[PDB]
Amino acid sequence: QESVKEFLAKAKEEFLKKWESPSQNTAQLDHFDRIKTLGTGSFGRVMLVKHKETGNHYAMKILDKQKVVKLKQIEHTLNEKRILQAVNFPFLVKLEFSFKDNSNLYMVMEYVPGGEMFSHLRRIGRFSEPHARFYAAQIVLTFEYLHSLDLIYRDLKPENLLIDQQGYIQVTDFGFAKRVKGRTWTLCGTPEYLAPEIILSKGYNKAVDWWALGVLIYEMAAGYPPFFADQPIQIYEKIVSGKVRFPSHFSSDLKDLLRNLLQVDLTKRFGNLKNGVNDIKNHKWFATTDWIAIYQRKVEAPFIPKFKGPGDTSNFDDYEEEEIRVSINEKCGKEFTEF
Numbered sequence: 001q002e003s004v005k006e007f008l009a010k011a012k013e014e015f016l017k018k019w020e021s022p023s024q025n026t027a028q029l030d031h032f033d034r035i036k037t038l039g040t041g042s043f044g045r046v047m048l049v050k051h052k053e054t055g056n057h058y059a060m061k062i063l064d065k066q067k068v069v070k071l072k073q074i075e076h077t078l079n080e081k082r083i084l085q086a087v088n089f090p091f092l093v094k095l096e097f098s099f100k101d102n103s104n105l106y107m108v109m110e111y112v113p114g115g116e117m118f119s120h121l122r123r124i125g126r127f128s129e130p131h132a133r134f135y136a137a138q139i140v141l142t143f144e145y146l147h148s149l150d151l152i153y154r155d156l157k158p159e160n161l162l163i164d165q166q167g168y169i170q171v172t173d174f175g176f177a178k179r180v181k182g183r184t185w186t187l188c189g190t191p192e193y194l195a196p197e198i199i200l201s202k203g204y205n206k207a208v209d210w211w212a213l214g215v216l217i218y219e220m221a222a223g224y225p226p227f228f229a230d231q232p233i234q235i236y237e238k239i240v241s242g243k244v245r246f247p248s249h250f251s252s253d254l255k256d257l258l259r260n261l262l263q264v265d266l267t268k269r270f271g272n273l274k275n276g277v278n279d280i281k282n283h284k285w286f287a288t289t290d291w292i293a294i295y296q297r298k299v300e301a302p303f304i305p306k307f308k309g310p311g312d313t314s315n316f317d318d319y320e321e322e323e324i325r326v327s328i329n330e331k332c333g334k335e336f337t338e339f
């Protein structure tokens, strides 16, 4: 489909130019006011900030260099920033600035006030198939884009999908994203979403993203993921088993697509066959999807999140507000030279 071919060729050209000459050091911390903590983790946080001169709001991801090193995430954090500064797609959150200081790494991203898909899904219970399909189509196109650039995303889950002011998806958190020719081996992701070949410590490829899409679509339409249990090891046993149970309310088309995405044999899994993404795009479950209209954001969304303005934090939850401390001495300078 020459139109798609030429689109992806241009996309790769533009990505490669930025990939080979990454931007660095494009703002500093005291250009911003701190507003609110939007999320936390073992080695970083995300803050709502306001730029003091323009008044624009942003989501600032702050990574503690010493904790990144301790938790063996050095290459991953370098991956995240190098990839984010080089990509450009309607459903990827934009990196606006990055910089580092003696203690931390900073990625300043567009602020998406609608919150995580996770919150909306848990609030409503489950999405109707048209609603799930609207979001799934955006992920399909996003993975078509990323995979053409030799990128694997490796962290698809509802918490990483923000809903924007038009009700479209913005993918965030490229902490496990990686440029991979051939195979890669790192154990990473979230247990419920891991493909069998990750669990079994194999060399794996982009097929793991298509498996995760199967998990996401199931969870969106059912309200719960297909492989669920108290301990990860019990989850992993279900994932590798080759068995999935579908709610009776699922359409036959949905069940058929999901059996082909949740295919334990990665050599038979949709997205990893000779026809690539088109086995998914042409599946009957997507028969009502106008792929170009989705890309162009011309489809009316299933819902618009409720929020009062670009500074509204109501769709995110409350965390202890901790200091952003910057040591008087540089930490881990060598490890993060390229950031």
Ligand SMILES: Oc1ccc2[nH]ccc2c1
Pocket (backbone or CB within 6 Å): 038, 039, 046, 058, 059, 093, 109, 110, 111, 112, 113, 162, 172, 173
């Ligand atoms: O706009 C954004 C971007 C990344 C994020 N991570 C957590 C909240 C959040 C908001």
